[PDB]
Amino acid sequence: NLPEHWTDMNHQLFCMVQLEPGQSEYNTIKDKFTRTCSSYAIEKIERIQNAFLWQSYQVKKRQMDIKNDHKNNERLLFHGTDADSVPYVNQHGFNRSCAGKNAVSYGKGTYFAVDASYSAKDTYSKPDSNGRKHMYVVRVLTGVFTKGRAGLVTPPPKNPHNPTDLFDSVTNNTRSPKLFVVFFDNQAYPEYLITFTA
Amino acid sequence: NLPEHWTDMNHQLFCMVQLEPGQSEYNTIKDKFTRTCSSYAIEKIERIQNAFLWQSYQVKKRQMDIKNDHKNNERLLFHGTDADSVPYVNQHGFNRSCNAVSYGKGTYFAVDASYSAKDTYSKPDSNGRKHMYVVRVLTGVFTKGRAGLVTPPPKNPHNPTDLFDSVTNNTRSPKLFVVFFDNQAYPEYLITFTA
Numbered sequence: 001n002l003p004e005h006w007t008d009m010n011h012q013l014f015c016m017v018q019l020e021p022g023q024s025e026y027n028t029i030k031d032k033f034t035r036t037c038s039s040y041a042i043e044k045i046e047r048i049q050n051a052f053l054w055q056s057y058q059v060k061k062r063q064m065d066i067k068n069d070h071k072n073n074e075r076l077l078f079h080g081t082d083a084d085s086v087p088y089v090n091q092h093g094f095n096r097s098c099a100g101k102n103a104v105s106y107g108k109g110t111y112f113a114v115d116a117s118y119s120a121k122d123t124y125s126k127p128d129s130n131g132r133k134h135m136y137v138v139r140v141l142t143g144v145f146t147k148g149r150a151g152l153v154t155p156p157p158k159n160p161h162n163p164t165d166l167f168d169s170v171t172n173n174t175r176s177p178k179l180f181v182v183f184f185d186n187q188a189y190p191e192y193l194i195t196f197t198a
Numbered sequence: 199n200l201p202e203h204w205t206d207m208n209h210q211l212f213c214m215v216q217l218e219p220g221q222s223e224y225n226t227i228k229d230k231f232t233r234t235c236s237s238y239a240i241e242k243i244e245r246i247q248n249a250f251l252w253q254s255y256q257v258k259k260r261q262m263d264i265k266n267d268h269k270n271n272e273r274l275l276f277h278g279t280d281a282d283s284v285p286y287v288n289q290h291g292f293n294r295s296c297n298a299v300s301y302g303k304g305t306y307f308a309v310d311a312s313y314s315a316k317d318t319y320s321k322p323d324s325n326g327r328k329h330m331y332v333v334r335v336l337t338g339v340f341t342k343g344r345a346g347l348v349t350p351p352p353k354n355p356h357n358p359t360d361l362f363d364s365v366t367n368n369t370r371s372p373k374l375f376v377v378f379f380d381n382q383a384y385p386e387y388l389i390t391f392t393a
């Protein structure tokens with residue numbers, strides 16, 4: 001059930017795995033980050049191996065793939081957060097109940113950025129006492145999306161006469177999406193933690 | 199792995215199935231309600247067959263059974279709600295983001311149907327129709343709740359991420375439980391009733 005290239009956790013449910021520079025797995029994340037954050041420097045990249053979060057996320061992905069009748073439902077996005085939140089996110093993922101109000105709100109949910117530069121703002125990846133900034137790389141089930149609105153506590157219906165048949169996520173702009181908001185647990189898998197500095 | 203007692207859905211993933219009165223299943227669910235709501239009038243009882251919600255719930259159950267190293271994590275509880283919320287709950291289950299929240303910002307479930315039968319929860323529509331779910335809830339290991347909780351407290355302040363599974367008003371003699379995560383509750387039956 002767990003991915004075959006994960007480290008053997010021998011009966012453990014959770015591990016953070018430090019990646020090596022020069023491995024394709026490290027370099028792809030570094031390249032994705034540096035595309036918009038070349039003024040910052042990466043300290044380390046850790047692969048998050050969380051068996052329970054993976055299981056629940058992969059069930060939601062299978063369900064969305066069935067429902068939407070295509071496999072274009074997942075995006076790899078960024079999430080900047082404070083040092084105090086990292087232990088919780090590593091273990092329990094992204095909790096909308098703990099989410100900050102975004103400077104431009106498209107709904108009351110968890111925000112994920114297309115560009116690492118957005119998540120790199122001190123407002124999100126708050127520097128800790130040692131000047132370390134923290135950004136997740138996240139598999140997000142964006143699915144079918146529409147432009148959000150500040151009042152949303154769930155994605156809006158696709159059709160106002162069928163209020164329970166929802167968009168999967170919302171965005172700031174459907175033609176040029178730069179942020180996505182999700183409103184349900186296990187719709188986002190924290191896959192890598194980037195620790196970085198100025 | 200859909201439950202044996204579900205009825206065939208012709209390759210669909212969601213069905214509300216009206217129960218036959220006088221058959222074992224209807225009688226069992228009716229008895230749980232009449233223990234405390236014998237003065238009410240039951241119009242019908244529906245089995246909620248929601249394959250996706252069941253799947254996500256059973257994954258959480260298996261995880262909680264592993265974490266707690268036992269299978270005593272599930273309780274059958276009641277949830278009263280308004281008619282306008284019923285379609286949402288049938289399809290999507292319980293959402294903490296959707297009354298007093300004295301034990302935390304989660305979804306509330308009653309031990310007694312009589313508590314859920316209060317008009318504040320099971321709001322009567324035009325014709326006096328009231329709605330109450332019978333819910334499978336992963337209460338697991340619980341502690342006393344308090345106002346402002348967004349998740350259950352930690353079991354020990356020394357491991358802040360190892361949480362209680364739910365909170366209650368009273369650990370010795372609980373009358374309500376609050377859960378704070380999606381897919382910790384499966385709406386199993388919908389009772390439509392009047393006072």
Ligand SMILES: NC(=O)c1ccc(OCC2CCCCC2)cc1
Pocket residue numbers: 276277278279297298299300301306307308313314315319374
């Ligand atoms: N929807 C329901 O059925 C339900 C709703 C609320 C509930 O307890 C809430 C109160 C909060 C103040 C102290 C006593 C308990 C139990 C069940």
